[PDB]
Design a protein around this ligand. Structure first.
Ligand SMILES: *[C@@H]1O[C@H](CO)[C@@H](O)[C@H](O)[C@H]1NC(C)=O
Lengths: 49, 40
């Protein structure tokens, strides 16, 4: 029990962070109807991007 | 993606010596129990 509580505490300490989108070629970047919230992103007008 | 992006704590650490020590304690304890059975 002590080892398992220490493992849970150390796993909180070893804190990684996942991301929503990890690529410009994402399947989320095909259609926002693929998931239930339609997310949104734009660019600056008349820009090089 | 061909070479750069392609690349090549836990519970295993706190189990091995503990398991072996408890197993050796069980092996010694069974013999001590049979000594106590021979005593009574
Ligand atoms: C962007 O380009 C259009 C092209 O007609 C221009 O009318 C507009 O003033 C420019 N400004 C904006 C909105 O970025």
């Amino acid at each position: 029990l002590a080892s398992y509580t220490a493992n849970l505490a150390a796993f909180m300490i070893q804190e990684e962070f996942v991301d929503q989108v990890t690529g410009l070629s994402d399947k989320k970047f095909q259609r926002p109807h693929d998931y239930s919230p339609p997310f949104r992103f734009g660019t600056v007008p008349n820009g090089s991007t | 993606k061909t070479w750069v992006r392609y690349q090549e704590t836990l519970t295993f650490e706190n189990m091995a010596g503990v398991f072996m020590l408890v197993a050796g304690g069980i092996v010694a304890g069974i013999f001590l129990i049979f000594i106590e059975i021979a005593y009574k």
